[PDB]
Design an enzyme around this catalytic site. Sequence first.
Site, PDB file in Angstrom:
ATOM      1  N   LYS A 100       0.965  -7.470   5.902  1.00  0.00           N
ATOM      2  CA  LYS A 100       0.908  -8.542   4.936  1.00  0.00           C
ATOM      3  C   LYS A 100       2.222  -8.566   4.163  1.00  0.00           C
ATOM      4  O   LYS A 100       2.731  -7.501   3.778  1.00  0.00           O
ATOM      5  CB  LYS A 100      -0.247  -8.398   3.933  1.00  0.00           C
ATOM      6  CG  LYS A 100      -1.575  -8.037   4.571  1.00  0.00           C
ATOM      7  CD  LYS A 100      -2.758  -7.936   3.601  1.00  0.00           C
ATOM      8  CE  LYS A 100      -3.914  -7.315   4.370  1.00  0.00           C
ATOM      9  NZ  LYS A 100      -3.835  -5.816   4.213  1.00  0.00           N
ATOM     10  N   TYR A 105       0.809  -1.211   0.000  1.00  0.00           N
ATOM     11  CA  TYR A 105       0.000   0.000   0.000  1.00  0.00           C
ATOM     12  C   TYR A 105       0.852   1.275   0.000  1.00  0.00           C
ATOM     13  O   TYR A 105       0.299   2.331  -0.312  1.00  0.00           O
ATOM     14  CB  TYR A 105      -0.988   0.072   1.183  1.00  0.00           C
ATOM     15  CG  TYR A 105      -1.932  -1.110   1.272  1.00  0.00           C
ATOM     16  CD1 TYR A 105      -2.124  -2.037   0.264  1.00  0.00           C
ATOM     17  CD2 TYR A 105      -2.665  -1.355   2.447  1.00  0.00           C
ATOM     18  CE1 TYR A 105      -3.013  -3.100   0.439  1.00  0.00           C
ATOM     19  CE2 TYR A 105      -3.531  -2.413   2.616  1.00  0.00           C
ATOM     20  CZ  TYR A 105      -3.708  -3.310   1.607  1.00  0.00           C
ATOM     21  OH  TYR A 105      -4.581  -4.362   1.781  1.00  0.00           O
TER      22      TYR A 105
HETATM   23  N1  LIG Z   1      -6.079  -8.796   1.577  1.00  0.00           N
HETATM   24  C1  LIG Z   1      -6.252  -8.197   0.400  1.00  0.00           C
HETATM   25  O1  LIG Z   1      -5.886  -8.598  -0.702  1.00  0.00           O
HETATM   26  C2  LIG Z   1      -7.143  -6.969   0.453  1.00  0.00           C
HETATM   27  C3  LIG Z   1      -7.780  -6.535  -0.701  1.00  0.00           C
HETATM   28  C4  LIG Z   1      -8.601  -5.406  -0.726  1.00  0.00           C
HETATM   29  C5  LIG Z   1      -8.795  -4.738   0.473  1.00  0.00           C
HETATM   30  N2  LIG Z   1      -8.142  -5.184   1.648  1.00  0.00           N
HETATM   31  C6  LIG Z   1      -8.310  -4.416   2.921  1.00  0.00           C
HETATM   32  O2  LIG Z   1      -9.717  -4.136   3.055  1.00  0.00           O
HETATM   33  C7  LIG Z   1      -9.872  -2.711   3.263  1.00  0.00           C
HETATM   34  C8  LIG Z   1     -11.262  -2.297   2.836  1.00  0.00           C
HETATM   35  O3  LIG Z   1     -11.459  -2.645   1.444  1.00  0.00           O
HETATM   36  P1  LIG Z   1     -11.400  -1.528   0.287  1.00  0.00           P
HETATM   37  O4  LIG Z   1     -10.443  -0.450   0.617  1.00  0.00           O
HETATM   38  O5  LIG Z   1     -11.157  -2.321  -0.962  1.00  0.00           O
HETATM   39  O6  LIG Z   1     -12.881  -0.942   0.228  1.00  0.00           O
HETATM   40  P2  LIG Z   1     -14.147  -0.619   1.184  1.00  0.00           P
HETATM   41  O7  LIG Z   1     -13.790  -0.525   2.582  1.00  0.00           O
HETATM   42  O8  LIG Z   1     -15.164  -1.621   0.742  1.00  0.00           O
HETATM   43  O9  LIG Z   1     -14.627   0.770   0.566  1.00  0.00           O
HETATM   44  C9  LIG Z   1     -13.756   1.927   0.675  1.00  0.00           C
HETATM   45  C10 LIG Z   1     -14.473   3.052  -0.039  1.00  0.00           C
HETATM   46  O10 LIG Z   1     -15.758   3.281   0.545  1.00  0.00           O
HETATM   47  C11 LIG Z   1     -15.835   4.647   0.979  1.00  0.00           C
HETATM   48  N3  LIG Z   1     -16.569   4.781   2.227  1.00  0.00           N
HETATM   49  C12 LIG Z   1     -16.118   4.407   3.462  1.00  0.00           C
HETATM   50  N4  LIG Z   1     -17.041   4.593   4.382  1.00  0.00           N
HETATM   51  C13 LIG Z   1     -18.079   5.093   3.694  1.00  0.00           C
HETATM   52  C14 LIG Z   1     -19.301   5.452   4.227  1.00  0.00           C
HETATM   53  N5  LIG Z   1     -19.654   5.377   5.495  1.00  0.00           N
HETATM   54  N6  LIG Z   1     -20.199   5.933   3.332  1.00  0.00           N
HETATM   55  C15 LIG Z   1     -19.921   6.050   2.034  1.00  0.00           C
HETATM   56  N7  LIG Z   1     -18.736   5.700   1.514  1.00  0.00           N
HETATM   57  C16 LIG Z   1     -17.800   5.214   2.375  1.00  0.00           C
HETATM   58  C17 LIG Z   1     -14.398   5.129   1.070  1.00  0.00           C
HETATM   59  O11 LIG Z   1     -14.336   6.536   0.866  1.00  0.00           O
HETATM   60  P3  LIG Z   1     -13.338   7.545   1.586  1.00  0.00           P
HETATM   61  O12 LIG Z   1     -12.094   6.891   1.978  1.00  0.00           O
HETATM   62  O13 LIG Z   1     -13.143   8.626   0.548  1.00  0.00           O
HETATM   63  O14 LIG Z   1     -14.140   8.023   2.748  1.00  0.00           O
HETATM   64  C18 LIG Z   1     -13.745   4.386  -0.075  1.00  0.00           C
HETATM   65  O15 LIG Z   1     -14.001   5.014  -1.349  1.00  0.00           O
HETATM   66  C19 LIG Z   1      -8.709  -2.128   2.470  1.00  0.00           C
HETATM   67  O16 LIG Z   1      -8.475  -0.748   2.620  1.00  0.00           O
HETATM   68  C20 LIG Z   1      -7.585  -3.051   2.880  1.00  0.00           C
HETATM   69  O17 LIG Z   1      -7.125  -2.609   4.172  1.00  0.00           O
HETATM   70  C21 LIG Z   1      -7.312  -6.303   1.658  1.00  0.00           C
HETATM   71  O1  LIG Z   2      -5.614  -4.216  -0.359  1.00  0.00           O
HETATM   72  C1  LIG Z   2      -5.213  -4.708  -1.400  1.00  0.00           C
HETATM   73  N1  LIG Z   2      -4.497  -5.808  -1.384  1.00  0.00           N
HETATM   74  C2  LIG Z   2      -4.190  -6.141  -2.647  1.00  0.00           C
HETATM   75  O2  LIG Z   2      -3.548  -7.070  -3.067  1.00  0.00           O
HETATM   76  C3  LIG Z   2      -4.778  -5.140  -3.627  1.00  0.00           C
HETATM   77  C4  LIG Z   2      -5.735  -5.765  -4.681  1.00  0.00           C
HETATM   78  C5  LIG Z   2      -5.071  -6.245  -5.984  1.00  0.00           C
HETATM   79  O3  LIG Z   2      -3.675  -5.923  -6.147  1.00  0.00           O
HETATM   80  C6  LIG Z   2      -3.107  -4.839  -5.485  1.00  0.00           C
HETATM   81  C7  LIG Z   2      -2.020  -4.198  -6.106  1.00  0.00           C
HETATM   82  C8  LIG Z   2      -1.415  -3.100  -5.478  1.00  0.00           C
HETATM   83  C9  LIG Z   2      -1.887  -2.640  -4.237  1.00  0.00           C
HETATM   84  F1  LIG Z   2      -1.307  -1.593  -3.643  1.00  0.00           F
HETATM   85  C10 LIG Z   2      -2.978  -3.279  -3.609  1.00  0.00           C
HETATM   86  C11 LIG Z   2      -3.587  -4.397  -4.258  1.00  0.00           C
HETATM   87  N2  LIG Z   2      -5.400  -4.293  -2.655  1.00  0.00           N
END
Ligand SMILES: NC(=O)c1ccc[n+]([C@@H]2O[C@H](COP(=O)([O-])OP(=O)(O)OC[C@H]3O[C@@H](n4cnc5c(N)ncnc54)[C@H](OP(=O)(O)O)[C@@H]3O)[C@@H](O)[C@H]2O)c1
Ligand SMILES: O=C1NC(=O)[C@@]2(CCOc3ccc(F)cc32)N1
EC number: 1.1.1.21
Length: 315
Positions: free
Chosen positions: A77, A48
């Site tokens: 991670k 990130y």
């Molecule tokens: N393990 C992996 O491969 C993996 C993959 C994807 C994600 N993750 C983790 O999961 C976390 C969450 O997933 P994500 O970032 O993909 O998306 P998310 O939490 O599903 O959605 C984030 C988005 O929703 C908005 N938002 C947040 N609260 C809101 C609310 N109350 N009302 C309206 N809009 C709102 C945010 O806007 P603003 O920020 O502009 O407020 C942002 O645009 C990540 O940040 C990461 O830490 C892990």
């Molecule tokens: O939270 C996240 N974990 C991830 O692996 C992902 C989704 C798919 O791939 C990428 C690539 C770059 C990154 F910063 C993030 C990501 N986002």
Amino acid sequence: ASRILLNNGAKMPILGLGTWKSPPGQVTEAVKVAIDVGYRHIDCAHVYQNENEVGVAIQEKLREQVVKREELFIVSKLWCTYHEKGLVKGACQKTLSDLKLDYLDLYLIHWPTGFKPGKEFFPLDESGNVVPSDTNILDTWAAMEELVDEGLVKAIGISNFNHLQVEMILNKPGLKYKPAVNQIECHPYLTQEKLIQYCQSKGIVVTAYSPLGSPDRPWAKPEDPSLLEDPRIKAIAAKHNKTTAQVLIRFPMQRNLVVIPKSVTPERIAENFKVFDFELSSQDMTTLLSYNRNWRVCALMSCTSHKDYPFHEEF
Ligand SMILES: NC(=O)c1ccc[n+]([C@@H]2O[C@H](COP(=O)([O-])OP(=O)(O)OC[C@H]3O[C@@H](n4cnc5c(N)ncnc54)[C@H](OP(=O)(O)O)[C@@H]3O)[C@@H](O)[C@H]2O)c1
Ligand SMILES: O=C1NC(=O)[C@@]2(CCOc3ccc(F)cc32)N1
């Protein structure tokens, strides 16, 4: 309850703050605000490119005595280019230095797919395919186990592992620590009943990512489903006097999952934490589950040819 017991004997806050796509110039205040309003779990990753700024916030709130380190649950991670045995400790140590911690509460293998080591996070051949690593994930797991034994991390886990890949770790010869967590995408359009049931039957806690369907994902498209805008979900929220987001966060909590909504907006960080004072009925829950359509935010599209690509298998 506010925390769930892991198979390492530690408790994990079921609500955490996500940080993927959180701009480095805003994530410090976002994490400060989160801790001020009650969050005690932060989800991080080296890939990130914002762990230093996350760390500034954590350190300032420890220094201010807003929170004690034992009361925080910090997750990071291992990125795909560091699956080699000899690179795992350094990757962890870089993350700890950036976060200004001396241990992580949980360190996850970010994907089952290992890539060629180097500066690029997605090393490419001259035709555009991602260059794999020949290290298998069982050997990477042993390296993660060493981190526990060196005191750098209190728990280890996995992320984006399919059922056969979880099973591969559980069946590793000489397995020393089972994974504590499997962090996977999960929301009403990707409900994951099979993978969750499998992991839970094994004592592995599931963390739901992208619980709001990641509206800020870089590859979003207009014809794409939108949870936040689904009038069916808005209706359940209205019924409960809550926001759509609050219902989307409460939903996995009631499936005994951990959930990590991301925001950098202070108002929304606070809003998203206000999910402990209401209950979805069983009917509401079954209704939300019925919206499944196996729609994925995070498909790692560029890696579908990798041997360890997790999303060919059903679950
Ligand atoms: N393990 C992996 O491969 C993996 C993959 C994807 C994600 N993750 C983790 O999961 C976390 C969450 O997933 P994500 O970032 O993909 O998306 P998310 O939490 O599903 O959605 C984030 C988005 O929703 C908005 N938002 C947040 N609260 C809101 C609310 N109350 N009302 C309206 N809009 C709102 C945010 O806007 P603003 O920020 O502009 O407020 C942002 O645009 C990540 O940040 C990461 O830490 C892990
Ligand atoms: O939270 C996240 N974990 C991830 O692996 C992902 C989704 C798919 O791939 C990428 C690539 C770059 C990154 F910063 C993030 C990501 N986002």
